[PDB]
Design a protein around this ligand. Structure first.
Ligand SMILES: O=C([O-])C(=O)[O-]
Ligand SMILES: [Mn+2]
Ligand SMILES: [Mn+2]
Ligand code: NA
Length: 610
């Protein structure tokens, strides 16, 4: 430099620009030049850093300590900033069609593209000087076990201490990640709450955000994630959805692997034989519930590898190896009870950050569906910081409120949850909320049919399409994604996992659920287990294999309505197939793999013959 305006060394309050890898320093310094932070804090990932940052946020009123628990915290946000906003979530590529198929109707439900040109304008409208008066935190994080050949590293720059704290839980972060990275490639993650000081607008609930300018951008060819205006969850914790789904799915396409919205669980039978299963459900269908299920069948054990995302790659032996890229659970809080999820309740008792849940007068947490009586006299403060009663119109916790907890604390965390080589997947489970027509469980007829079943997934929010549970998350053209899945069948040695589809939520003719669910879902898993083992416990139907008469263990369940629960009606499925046909033609069109259209034609024909 000729002057003093490019070297940010004097601004570093922890760490050293001289200690960073070359490309890390350039990423850090270049963005400091643009965003103009008062300070640069290079995170070390220490407990000391963590505790002090927590106490600082506490003193500022950004978070509250929950006194009932061990080292637990509560953040209440500005009500404008409570969730991911897909309309403000975009992927930038040279051509639109690389990001999304071109829909015949004109409006895509499979993603949202922005031109390079439009993003540049948006970027320039947002980031210059955006961190004035704030600390820029530098988060070196690994997605996956540090030593895993399947793990990927990112650097996230942020002006939110809430993000730092949450990222510590959700990823492996700190000095060891920088040491592991060296001069290797990393995903560039830039985040700002978009409120430079002095504040131009009112600070609501001590929660910095810029709703009008909120934009969550992905530049896969630049390996960059750029997010502005939201401090919340999947908008700000850049490793989770942005990196481990959107960027990663593109990388996976390029490199021969898969990045998927799937839980990973290990299940052991009463004979000591263990299998790993993956399952993709929409974000309201019992995913965390299944991942840390407490099975009701004697002698069965379920252990949790991950509850949200899976990175999967065939090894030289042909086994589909999976890792959980995350280091914690960012779970939806309402609906979590000792009934629905006893192991979740146990996990979140300590070292856990809660966001937008209710607080009890004795320093505890509360939300809809917690199904836990309070002592008389104990009162509730809602997520809106106001007195609340169980009979009031509005809920005490926001529907998208969250716990943010360490994975290592789950009482049934799998002993291989951090194994570098990953765990061998033997089955993949798709599923949704369908009150009618769709059986409790069926098995895909082939890999190609299995990919179709994934592609055809629909779930009651109105029943909407959500293929592979990836609708908000495709890093690239969904048709190409289908092609990618299909190509797995053409590599020699590959042991293709059996594919199943589940529906826990089928109802009778008056609104009553047909299946008790929760821990009883172990009875369905047992069937899958046996089918993987090659047992003839199946009956052929037009939609795939279903359990034979008496194949399902229904002991202790009373009078289960088997005929309704597993009923398949021509009328319903004629409608179903036409709807899938119209959806795929519109939304995928020219990019629809031949094999998928073939499976569609085949299903239609099987239905026509019943
Ligand atoms: O936060 C999540 O996990 C989601 O929205 O799928
Ligand atoms: Mn998810
Ligand atoms: Mn359930
Ligand atoms: Na707050």
């Amino acid at each position: 430099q000729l002057h003093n305006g490019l070297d940010f060394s004097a601004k570093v309050i922890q760490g050293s620009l001289d200690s960073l890898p070359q490309e890390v320093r350039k990423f850090v310094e270049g963005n400091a030049q643009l965003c103009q932070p008062e300070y640069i804090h290079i995170c070390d990932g220490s407990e000391e850093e963590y505790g002090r940052l927590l106490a600082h946020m506490q003193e500022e009123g950004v978070i509250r300590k929950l006194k009932k628990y061990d080292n637990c915290w509560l953040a209440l946000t500005d009500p404008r900033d409570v969730a991911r906003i897909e309309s403000k979530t975009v992927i930038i590529t040279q051509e639109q069609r690389d990001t999304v198929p071109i829909p015949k109707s004109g409006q895509s439900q499979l993603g949202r593209w922005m031109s390079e040109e439009d993003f540049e304008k948006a970027f320039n409208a947002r980031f210059p000087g955006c961190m004035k008066g704030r600390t820029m935190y530098v988060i070196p994080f690994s997605m996956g076990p540090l030593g895993s050949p399947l793990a990927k590293i990112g650097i996230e720059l942020t002006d939110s201490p809430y993000v730092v704290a949450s990222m510590r839980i959700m990823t492996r972060m700190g000095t060891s990640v920088l040491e592991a990275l060296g001069d290797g490639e990393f995903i560039k993650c830039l985040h700002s709450v978009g409120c430079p000081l002095p504040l131009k607008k009112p600070l609501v609930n001590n929660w910095a955000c810029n709703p009008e300018l909120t934009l969550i951008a992905h530049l896969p060819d630049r390996r960059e994630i750029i997010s502005f205006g939201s401090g919340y969850g999947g908008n700000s914790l850049l490793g989770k959805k942005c990196f481990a789904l959107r960027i990663a799915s593109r990388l996976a396409k390029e490199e021969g692997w898969l990045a998927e919205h799937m839980l990973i669980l290990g299940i052991t039978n009463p004979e000591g034989k263990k299998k790993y299963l993956a399952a993709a459900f929409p974000s309201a269908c019992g995913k965390t519930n299944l991942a840390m299920m407490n099975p009701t069948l004697p002698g069965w054990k379920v252990e949790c590898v991950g509850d949200d995302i899976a990175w999967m790659k065939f090894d030289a032996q042909g086994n589909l190896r999976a890792i959980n890229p995350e280091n914690g659970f960012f779970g939806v809080a309402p609906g979590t009870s000792v009934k629905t999820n006893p192991n979740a309740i146990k996990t979140i008792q300590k070292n856990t950050i809660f966001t937008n849940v209710a607080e009890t007068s004795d320093g505890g947490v509360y939300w809809e569906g917690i199904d836990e009586p309070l002592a008389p006299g104990v009162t509730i403060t809602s997520w809106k910081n106001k007195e609340w009663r169980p009979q009031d119109e509005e809920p005490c916790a926001h529907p998208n409120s969250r716990f943010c907890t360490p994975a290592s604390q789950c009482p049934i965390i799998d002993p291989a949850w951090e194994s570098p080589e990953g765990v061998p997947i033997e089955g993949i489970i798709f599923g949704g909320r369908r009150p009618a027509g769709v059986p409790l469980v069926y098995e895909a007829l082939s890999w190609q049919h299995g990919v179709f079943v994934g592609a055809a997934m629909r779930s009651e929010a109105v029943i909407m399409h959500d293929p592979f549970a990836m609708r908000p998350f495709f890093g690239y053209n969904f048709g190409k994604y289908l092609a990618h899945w299909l190509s797995m069948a053409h590599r020699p040695a590959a042991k293709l996992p059996k594919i199943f589809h589940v529906n826990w939520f089928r109802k009778d003719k008056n609104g009553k659920f047909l299946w008790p669910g929760f821990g009883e879902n172990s009875r369905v898993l047992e069937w899958m287990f046996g089918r993987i083992e090659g047992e003839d416990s199946a009956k052929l139907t037009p939609i795939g294999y279903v359990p034979k008469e008496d194949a399902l263990n229904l002991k202790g369940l009373g009078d289960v309505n088997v005929e309704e629960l597993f009923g398949i009606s021509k009328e319903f499925w004629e409608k179903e197939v036409e709807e899938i046909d119209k959806y795929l033609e519109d939304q995928v069109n020219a990019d629809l793999p031949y094999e998928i259209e073939r499976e569609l034609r085949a299903l239609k024909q099987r239905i026509s013959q019943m």
